[PDB]
Design a protein around this ligand. Structure first.
Ligand SMILES: C[C@]12CC[C@H]3[C@@H](CCC4=CC(=O)CC[C@@]43C)[C@@H]1CC[C@@H]2OC(=O)CCC(=O)O
Ligand SMILES: C[C@]12CC[C@H]3[C@@H](CCC4=CC(=O)CC[C@@]43C)[C@@H]1CC[C@@H]2OC(=O)CCC(=O)O
Lengths: 111, 111
């Protein structure tokens, strides 16, 4: 099943560029590569601003470049502007989800 | 029925702040606010960079600030990294959609 990795996953800051990668993905499929923080139970606030994208290769595998920040203005996956997120408090992490939300587990991160 | 308006729309450049306004929206409904180009008959390629959003007030209205750019690396609404968009040939426009794609008709812009 889908796998996901980020690097560096710890010891980061605002602007620090990391390498997100995934596996078990559906070949040719487009996977959103964004950062988030479960603002609520089951719900996320992510940063479009530095958002990114990855398409799964033949072997459901791919990769791309992200640029994480300590704090960001947050948006829900429905469009809601949740405003400013974290400053080191709650746990942001990198999301890899497609058109149907399908994706691996959220790779927790820390600042 | 739902309504949409930008200002200014014509005579634009790179980094231009526009005034998007909605109407006949569903109150409490979240509308992403993005610069996009019909890269295909139906399809759009958006700038996730300067995105905005607007929560319809009580009578289905609300507004916010958008900052346009002549050209931009684009994304399809499925996560696909489209690649660079326009330079003044194709007709980007400001889209206003909620999580179900619903929303009023994109208004024509130009640099
Ligand atoms: C694409 C998506 C809505 C748009 C989200 C995306 C996660 C990444 C993301 C981060 C943002 O901050 C902008 C919106 C966005 C790009 C979500 C992952 C799944 C979701 O879609 C749905 O819940 C509906 C799809 C379905 O019917 O399964
Ligand atoms: C949310 C959305 C995909 C994510 C899009 C959003 C338009 C605004 C937007 C701009 C970007 O550049 C990032 C993705 C994104 C936030 C689209 C509007 C409708 C679309 O699809 C759906 O969620 C509906 C799923 C379906 O209709 O099958």
């Amino acid at each position: 099943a889908p796998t996901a990795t980020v690097t560096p996953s710890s010891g980061l800051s605002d602007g620090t560029v990391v390498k997100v990668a995934g596996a078990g993905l559906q070949a040719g499929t487009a996977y959103w590569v964004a950062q988030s923080a479960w603002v609520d139970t089951g719900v996320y606030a992510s940063n479009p601003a530095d958002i990114s994208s990855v398409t799964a290769d033949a072997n459901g595998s791919a990769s791309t470049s992200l640029t994480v920040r300590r704090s960001f203005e947050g948006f829900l996956w429905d469009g809601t502007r949740w405003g400013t997120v974290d400053c080191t408090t709650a746990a942001c992490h990198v999301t890899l989800r497609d058109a149907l939300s399908n994706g691996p587990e959220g790779v927790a991160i820390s600042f």
